[PDB]
Enzyme design. Structure first.
Site, mmCIF file in Angstrom:
data_model
loop_
_atom_site.group_PDB
_atom_site.id
_atom_site.type_symbol
_atom_site.label_atom_id
_atom_site.label_comp_id
_atom_site.label_asym_id
_atom_site.label_seq_id
_atom_site.Cartn_x
_atom_site.Cartn_y
_atom_site.Cartn_z
ATOM 1 N N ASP A 189 51.636 47.309 47.882
ATOM 2 C CA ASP A 189 51.461 48.361 48.211
ATOM 3 C C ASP A 189 51.765 48.753 50.061
ATOM 4 O O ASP A 189 51.190 48.906 50.794
ATOM 5 C CB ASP A 189 50.045 48.344 48.745
ATOM 6 C CG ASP A 189 48.931 49.765 48.783
ATOM 7 O OD1 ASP A 189 49.516 50.588 48.817
ATOM 8 O OD2 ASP A 189 47.644 49.989 49.247
ATOM 9 N N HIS A 345 52.499 43.778 56.893
ATOM 10 C CA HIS A 345 53.285 44.378 56.800
ATOM 11 C C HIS A 345 54.957 44.149 58.176
ATOM 12 O O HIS A 345 54.495 44.603 58.659
ATOM 13 C CB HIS A 345 53.169 45.801 56.082
ATOM 14 C CG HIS A 345 53.194 45.591 54.626
ATOM 15 N ND1 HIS A 345 54.386 45.119 53.315
ATOM 16 C CD2 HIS A 345 51.564 45.088 53.479
ATOM 17 C CE1 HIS A 345 53.527 45.139 52.484
ATOM 18 N NE2 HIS A 345 52.148 44.877 52.417
ATOM 19 N N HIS A 379 53.688 41.640 52.041
ATOM 20 C CA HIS A 379 53.650 40.222 51.135
ATOM 21 C C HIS A 379 55.194 40.210 50.394
ATOM 22 O O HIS A 379 55.478 40.102 49.323
ATOM 23 C CB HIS A 379 52.662 40.964 49.482
ATOM 24 C CG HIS A 379 51.187 41.607 49.551
ATOM 25 N ND1 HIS A 379 50.228 40.546 50.346
ATOM 26 C CD2 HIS A 379 50.994 42.719 49.827
ATOM 27 C CE1 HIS A 379 49.928 41.667 50.746
ATOM 28 N NE2 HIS A 379 49.863 42.611 50.291
ATOM 29 N N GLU A 404 54.921 40.479 42.851
ATOM 30 C CA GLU A 404 53.537 41.653 43.071
ATOM 31 C C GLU A 404 53.285 42.295 41.955
ATOM 32 O O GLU A 404 54.753 43.450 41.565
ATOM 33 C CB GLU A 404 53.395 41.827 43.959
ATOM 34 C CG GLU A 404 52.131 43.496 44.078
ATOM 35 C CD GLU A 404 51.594 43.320 45.266
ATOM 36 O OE1 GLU A 404 51.427 42.795 46.120
ATOM 37 O OE2 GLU A 404 50.131 44.552 45.193
ATOM 38 N N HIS A 406 51.277 43.828 40.383
ATOM 39 C CA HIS A 406 49.910 44.845 40.133
ATOM 40 C C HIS A 406 49.877 45.813 39.600
ATOM 41 O O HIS A 406 49.062 45.795 38.559
ATOM 42 C CB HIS A 406 49.538 45.402 41.533
ATOM 43 C CG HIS A 406 47.906 46.263 42.183
ATOM 44 N ND1 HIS A 406 47.121 45.581 43.413
ATOM 45 C CD2 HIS A 406 46.849 46.288 41.112
ATOM 46 C CE1 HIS A 406 46.085 46.009 43.420
ATOM 47 N NE2 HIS A 406 45.934 46.286 41.856
ATOM 48 N N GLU A 449 48.577 39.784 43.702
ATOM 49 C CA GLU A 449 48.263 40.973 43.116
ATOM 50 C C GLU A 449 49.015 40.687 41.610
ATOM 51 O O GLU A 449 50.067 42.186 41.415
ATOM 52 C CB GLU A 449 47.627 42.604 43.092
ATOM 53 C CG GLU A 449 47.321 41.876 44.709
ATOM 54 C CD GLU A 449 46.731 43.640 45.032
ATOM 55 O OE1 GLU A 449 46.822 43.786 45.486
ATOM 56 O OE2 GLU A 449 45.371 42.938 45.294
ATOM 57 N N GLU A 525 42.132 38.273 52.873
ATOM 58 C CA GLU A 525 42.280 39.901 52.989
ATOM 59 C C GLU A 525 40.541 39.750 53.081
ATOM 60 O O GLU A 525 40.030 39.633 52.122
ATOM 61 C CB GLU A 525 43.137 41.044 51.932
ATOM 62 C CG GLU A 525 44.898 40.569 51.589
ATOM 63 C CD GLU A 525 45.594 41.710 50.465
ATOM 64 O OE1 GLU A 525 46.396 40.985 50.218
ATOM 65 O OE2 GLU A 525 44.543 42.656 50.448
ATOM 66 N N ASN A 585 51.214 60.037 44.559
ATOM 67 C CA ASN A 585 50.805 59.223 45.481
ATOM 68 C C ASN A 585 49.368 58.257 46.335
ATOM 69 O O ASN A 585 48.548 59.243 44.793
ATOM 70 C CB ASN A 585 51.107 59.748 46.351
ATOM 71 C CG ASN A 585 50.619 61.265 46.988
ATOM 72 O OD1 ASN A 585 49.642 61.324 47.949
ATOM 73 N ND2 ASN A 585 51.473 62.365 46.887
ATOM 74 N N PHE A 589 46.038 55.492 51.638
ATOM 75 C CA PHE A 589 46.285 54.467 52.223
ATOM 76 C C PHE A 589 47.080 53.748 52.457
ATOM 77 O O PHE A 589 46.497 52.232 52.082
ATOM 78 C CB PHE A 589 45.166 54.268 50.445
ATOM 79 C CG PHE A 589 44.463 54.436 49.928
ATOM 80 C CD1 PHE A 589 43.267 55.347 49.484
ATOM 81 C CD2 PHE A 589 43.352 53.500 50.606
ATOM 82 C CE1 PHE A 589 42.044 55.648 49.046
ATOM 83 C CE2 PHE A 589 41.934 53.651 49.623
ATOM 84 C CZ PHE A 589 40.828 54.603 49.365
ATOM 85 N N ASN A 592 45.988 51.471 57.190
ATOM 86 C CA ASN A 592 44.838 50.378 57.320
ATOM 87 C C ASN A 592 45.067 49.443 58.359
ATOM 88 O O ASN A 592 43.808 48.897 58.439
ATOM 89 C CB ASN A 592 45.153 49.391 55.911
ATOM 90 C CG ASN A 592 45.239 50.201 54.286
ATOM 91 O OD1 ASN A 592 45.902 49.384 54.059
ATOM 92 N ND2 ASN A 592 43.910 51.448 54.391
HETATM 93 O O1 GTZ Z 1 44.816 48.771 51.286
HETATM 94 C C1 GTZ Z 1 44.267 48.976 50.324
HETATM 95 C C2 GTZ Z 1 44.302 47.332 49.697
HETATM 96 C C3 GTZ Z 1 45.609 46.721 49.759
HETATM 97 O O2 GTZ Z 1 46.622 47.633 48.883
HETATM 98 C C4 GTZ Z 1 45.421 45.426 49.505
HETATM 99 O O3 GTZ Z 1 46.718 44.352 49.408
HETATM 100 C C5 GTZ Z 1 44.926 44.442 47.626
HETATM 101 O O4 GTZ Z 1 43.708 44.052 48.261
HETATM 102 C C6 GTZ Z 1 43.892 46.097 47.659
HETATM 103 N N1 GTZ Z 1 43.248 46.044 46.337
HETATM 104 N N2 GTZ Z 1 42.469 47.610 46.859
HETATM 105 N N3 GTZ Z 1 42.701 48.141 47.330
HETATM 106 N N4 GTZ Z 1 43.491 46.876 48.420
HETATM 107 MG MG MG Z 2 48.784 45.806 45.335
HETATM 108 NA NA NA Z 3 47.232 50.118 51.789
#
Ligand code: GTZ
Ligand code: MG
Ligand code: NA
Ligand code: MG
Ligand code: NA
Lengths: 1011, 210
Positions: A189, A345, A379, A404, A406, A449, A525, A585, A589, A592
């Site tokens: 992310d 990051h 990550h 990753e 996801h 993830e 996290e 996009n 988000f 953070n």
């Molecule tokens: O800031 C958004 C976050 C981030 O990407 C985290 O790595 C992940 O655990 C996640 N899952 N859902 N939202 N997130």
């Molecule tokens: Mg992710």
């Molecule tokens: Na994020």
């Protein structure tokens, strides 16, 4: 062959991974870690040309330069120079999901460089090139001929150039593809960029060379005795005269040394490793490494001849530390850690994902000054220097494989696929092979993830088998699978269960004691620091402290991933998802962070600093009990600084040095405090100060603080009877209250104080009215959009019930003349589609002393979503330069985020009462304020407030901070009660029940006067 | 000194309004020249004959939190029934009110007293919005008890059987009431969220004869 679309080919002719080399040809240089002639940086100016796919690269580019090509700096991400748009996406892959294929239109970056190579580098020896990071795959050419291919954009790809280089002038050609089959494994992310974004170099090794070395330290029961064990491996022709010496130095003294010929011990029926040697040194009373004291030693590994002649030497820092799990606890040197961690990051607002020394030094000092002691590499493996820096400054590192997935459905589709085992394993094995020697690495992680698959199981075991010195963790597929030594959930709440099917997030306190569970729990996290957040942070740290097997977590995350863009005036503004044309996009988000992209702290950072303190305090009678949470260090650079103040005014102070053993107590007796006369609340404030500068902090740095209410004398003395008596003027339109120069207008048709006057100067721009809403924070919005409504997020419950569309309907407006005051009684009902949402019953009491006393009594319908706030607001015409207040400060603070704030007298420039969240929301509130001062005005009571040049409506309607305009006058929000801010996560409601305004009936009272 | 503290009058004024009379009082409770509680009231009697009581109590931060914040008085009336809109029918307290239901309840007076062998505070009902006794009616949002025994008598009596009916009826109306503990009976056991520690407390009543 299309190797970038084939996960069975992840590299061609790439050299074996290994730890940091420098190929010194001088023992001392290796020992003192000086620059090495055999390691040349090739960073600097390169020749680059963009293409829309590889098939569009003209075949001439291998042979000689392209005229169309520009000159750009390497390392970099080419997105940061403007060749295409960086893409921000969270879960959904930036490319179509169709493994192993990528899009035919594949943004291709062409890097070239003409450069010298000296005669002496080719006459003998080995000359390799090292690309520390290349996103996401590349082919390499040298002087026209093809060399090889490499994947994994987070570990260094190395190639032997010996037979490609010619004396003098040489030319590299590096075709870098943005998308490859590797990209399926790289769905973190973050911004999706590309290019040669890490160091490039040339390493010259002798023909007979050190090819790898591993360092291990075993201890006795009490850590008074240690054996260091170094396995040294070689390439080249073995010889009976070859020897290895491993020497351990601490500073300038040589503590231990071993010399041996090659030929390992017998490992099986076929013999042993002839091309290897292990050196065993004893070390008595070793200075043990920790985040508290990063005692480092230095290991020099010398390949040389029997007769004395040095061939080459490599080195590393060695920290003597043991990391194990026993009886359910994660121990370091026999002591149960408490992880005050954070995810980080690799991000810079200008350079993209290109890392530098200064920024990494910056980050570490900030982290450390804010009572962080551990970092997780979310990550992916980091820039190599990062580990050197954690080794030396002292931070516990979690090293994470670059895996990753996801976006997949289900999340483990590839990681459960055996055809994907190969690609994954290289991402793990090469990490361990590079980083296993750094003391700061305490835990390996298998990625992020990517569900849970048999490949994780295989690799987990792999690590355990190769490196037993470190526990292994991985969150995927439920946070407690058979592929993890540590229960490492993400955003598991402290008390509240979230029983999702198959992969539930249990409350951490309940999670520990599930039948058969025995492991320690450390969140990978938690406490999503998105915008105005970190509400409920105190609950975690109280839980961590009470539960031995709750050993902490890593906050998400360190820095906002905002990028720099420029408007028409060349003025810089912080940008997020979609601001580059990138679509689809995930908007804001990406931000953070506990800090802004430029490393400016968010108000949330101080909450962390407080909660993660290493000293704990209690007060009994007039005894302060200081408790050290340090594991290894004595409090040898701390002194306690107390003061007692009555409503801001200092009464007594002191200074007592701290002398607490790790895990120890110190009792401090406050002298007889001189009991003051006048009414008010006495407050004791302790803070811990470090008199001396350290490697990480300046002299005088505050590391811990706390407050207690001491005595209170309530006020019992009547205000002296007024000279004058206010005059009422009745009017079908207005009630006008006059007294001296001061005037108060109450519009009899609205029912609010419409205007105030001091002489002939207007005070109010918009009248003073109740407010039951706020500009939605990120945790109020969640994942709700315009096109995708989430009816469960707070902002949406408020919208649908009409909180924002509600208009005040006047019920009652009366004026009464008293002995020495005028009394206005007002009543309102806010409604929407005929539903009474709020009732507001007030009284304003203006006496001869020119003081107005507002009494608010609000009703809230039980069936309406609990309101964001209950208060009053108005726009003051006055614009002053300062804000002065008696209450919690100095930084922004909310009900569920106010522990770090102190009660005192606070003076600050107006500008500091606004918090520049890149996505603007309700901001700048301070809590428990008894007295507020703005220009001529003073409000007294017990309330929360924020004060700024932006309305709630403007903040609500504006997407970026850089588009906000100061408004005429100053907006003031005075809340009797304010809802909490949540932040356990940012994608479902997270405001804990005790911080929602559910009471039904609310009461607050104000006194407004002009001093 | 909570048991020993005597009210000192700070303020007591009367005002005639358009359709009401407003009385404004302010008391301090003190012990050894330490002020424990301040109680600022207003009473508003209008043409309908309703008395609008408003109470605003301050509690010194450094005093041990009070058992309650409320009004008491011994009524002359001795009525047979008690009728209230709130949590019942049985005795319920803040940390022991999950068993009680919100409804209109009518009981005989003797049911509003719990015969604990050792006499104490008892028979409180919580979350009451309306209370009816004889000719009297109190409306608001409070907790109350009503019995033939003063708090004083209960405090001074060691056995239930030695208790005697006092002339008239004792009414205790509380804006707020401390929890009752129970985790054990040998150390403080009232949990923090049921301790009266807010420092400033507000409640409003309306007293009419319907
Ligand atoms: O800031 C958004 C976050 C981030 O990407 C985290 O790595 C992940 O655990 C996640 N899952 N859902 N939202 N997130
Ligand atoms: Mg992710
Ligand atoms: Na994020
Ligand atoms: Mg491939
Ligand atoms: Na713990």
């Amino acid at each position: 062959r299309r190797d970038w679309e084939n996960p069975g080919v992840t590299q061609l002719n790439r050299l074996a991974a290994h730890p940091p080399f420098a190929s010194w040809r001088n023992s001392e240089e290796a020992r003192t870690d000086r620059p090495s002639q055999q390691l040349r940086s090739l960073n600097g100016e390169w020749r680059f040309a963009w293409f829309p796919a590889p098939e569009a690269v003209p075949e001439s580019w291998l042979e000689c330069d392209l005229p169309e090509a520009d000159t750009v700096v390497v390392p970099s991400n080419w997105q940061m120079h403007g060749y295409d748009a960086p893409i921000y996406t969270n879960v959904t892959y930036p490319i179509t999901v169709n493994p192993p294929f990528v899009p035919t239109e594949n943004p291709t970056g062409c890097y070239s460089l003409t450069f010298n190579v000296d005669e002496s580098w080719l006459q003998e020896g080995q000359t390799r090139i090292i690309f520390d990071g290349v996103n996401s795959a590349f082919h390499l050419w040298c002087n026209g001929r093809w060399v090889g291919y490499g994947q994994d954009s987070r570990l260094p790809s190395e190639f032997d150039l010996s037979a490609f280089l010619r004396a003098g002038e040489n030319r590299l050609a590096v075709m870098v593809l943005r998308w490859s089959d590797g990209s399926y494994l790289e769905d973190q992310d973050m911004w999706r960029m590309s290019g040669i974004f890490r160091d490039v170099s040339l390493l010259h090794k002798p023909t007979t060379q050190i090819s790898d070395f591993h360092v291990a330290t075993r201890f006795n029961d009490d850590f008074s005795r240690a054996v260091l064990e170094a396995e040294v491996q070689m390439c080249g022709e073995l010889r009976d005269y070859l020897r290895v010496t491993v020497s351990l130095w601490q500073g300038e003294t040589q503590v231990a040394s071993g010399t041996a010929p090659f030929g390992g011990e017998i490992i099986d029926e076929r013999g042993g490793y002839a091309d290897r040697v292990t050196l065993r040194l004893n070390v008595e009373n070793p200075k043990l490494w920790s985040a508290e004291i990063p005692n480092l030693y230095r290991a020099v590994v010398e390949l040389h001849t029997a007769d004395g002649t040095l061939i080459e030497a490599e080195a590393c820092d060695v920290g003597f530390r043991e990391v194990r799990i026993e009886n359910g606890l994660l121990l370091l040197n026999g002591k149960p850690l408490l992880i005050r961690g954070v995810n980080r990051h690799e991000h810079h607002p200008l350079h993209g994902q290109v890392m530098d020394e200064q920024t990494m030094v910056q980050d570490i000092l900030l982290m450390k000054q804010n009572n962080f002691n551990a970092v997780r590499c979310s990550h992916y493996p980091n820039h190599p220097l990062w580990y050197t820096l954690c080794d030396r400054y002292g931070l516990y590192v979690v090293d994470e494989a670059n895996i990753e997935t996801h976006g997949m459905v289900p999340m483990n589709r590839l990681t459960d696929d055996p055809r994907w085992l190969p690609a994954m394993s290289e991402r793990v094995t090469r990490m361990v092979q590079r980083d296993r020697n750094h003391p700061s690495v305490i835990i390996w992680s298998l990625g992020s993830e990517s569900g849970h698959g048999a490949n994780h199981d295989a690799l987990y075991r792999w690590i355990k088998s190769v490196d037993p010195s470190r526990p292994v963790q991985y969150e995927g597929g439920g946070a407690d699978t058979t592929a993890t030594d540590i229960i490492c959930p993400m955003y598991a709440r402290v008390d509240e269960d979230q029983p999702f099917p198959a992969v539930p997030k249990w409350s951490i306190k309940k999670w520990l004691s599930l039948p058969g569970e025995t492991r320690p729990l450390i969140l990978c996290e938690y406490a999503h620091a998105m915008g105005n957040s970190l509400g409920g942070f105190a609950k975690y740290w109280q839980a961590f402290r009470q539960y031995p097997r709750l050993q902490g977590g890593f906050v998400w995350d360190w820095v906002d991933q905002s990028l720099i863009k420029y408007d028409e005036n060349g003025n810089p503004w912080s940008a997020y998802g979609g601001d580059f044309g990138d679509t689809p996009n995930d908007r804001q988000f990406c931000m953070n962070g506990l800090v802004f992209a430029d490393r400016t702290p968010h108000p949330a950072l101080t909450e962390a600093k407080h909660q993660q303190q290493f000293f704990q305090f209690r007060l009994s009678g007039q005894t302060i009990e200081v408790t050290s949470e340090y594991l290894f260090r004595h409090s040898d650079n701390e002194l306690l600084h107390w003061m007692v103040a009555l409503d801001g005014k200092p009464l007594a102070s002191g200074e007592v040095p701290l002398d607490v053993a790790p895990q120890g107590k110190q009792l401090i007796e406050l002298p007889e405090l001189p009991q003051p006369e006048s009414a008010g609340q006495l407050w004791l404030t302790v803070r811990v100060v470090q008199p001396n500068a350290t490697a990480w902090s300046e002299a005088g740095h505050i590391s811990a603080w706390q407050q207690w209410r001491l005595a209170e004398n309530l006020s019992v003395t009547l205000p002296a009877a007024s000279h004058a008596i206010p005059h009422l003027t009745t009017s079908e339109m207005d009630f006008c209250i006059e007294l001296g120069n001061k005037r108060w207008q109450f519009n009899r048709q609205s029912g609010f104080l419409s205007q105030m006057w001091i002489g002939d100067k207007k005070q109010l721009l918009t009248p003073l009215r109740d407010q039951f809403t706020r500009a939605p924070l990120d945790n109020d919005i969640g994942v709700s959009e315009a096109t995708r409504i989430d009816p469960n997020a707070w902002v949406e419950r408020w919208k649908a019930a009409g909180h924002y569309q509600a208009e005040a309907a006047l019920l009652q407006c009366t004026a009464d003349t008293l002995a020495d005051a005028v009394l206005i009684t007002t009543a309102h009902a806010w409604q929407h589609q005929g539903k009474t949402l709020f009732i507001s019953r007030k009284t304003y009491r203006i006496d001869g002393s020119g003081q107005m006393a507002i009494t608010v009594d609000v009703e809230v319908a039980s069936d309406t979503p609990h309101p964001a706030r209950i208060g009053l607001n108005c726009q003051l015409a006055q614009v002053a330069e300062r804000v002065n207040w008696l209450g919690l400060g100095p930084q922004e603070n909310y009900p569920d985020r106010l522990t770090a704030a102190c009660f005192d007298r606070w003076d600050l420039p107006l500008s500091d009462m606004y918090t520049p969240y890149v996505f603007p929301s309700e901001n700048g509130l301070r809590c428990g304020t008894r007295e507020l001062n703005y220009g001529p005005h003073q409000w007294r009571g017990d309330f929360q407030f924020n004060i700024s040049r932006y309305s709630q409506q403007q903040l609500m309607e504006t997407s970026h901070r850089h588009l906000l305009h100061a408004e005429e006058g100053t907006w003031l929000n005075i809340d009797g009660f304010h809802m909490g801010i949540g932040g356990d996560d940012s994608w479902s409601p997270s405001v804990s029940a005790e911080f929602q305004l559910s009471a039904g009936r609310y009461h607050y009272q104000l006194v407004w006067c002009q001093k």
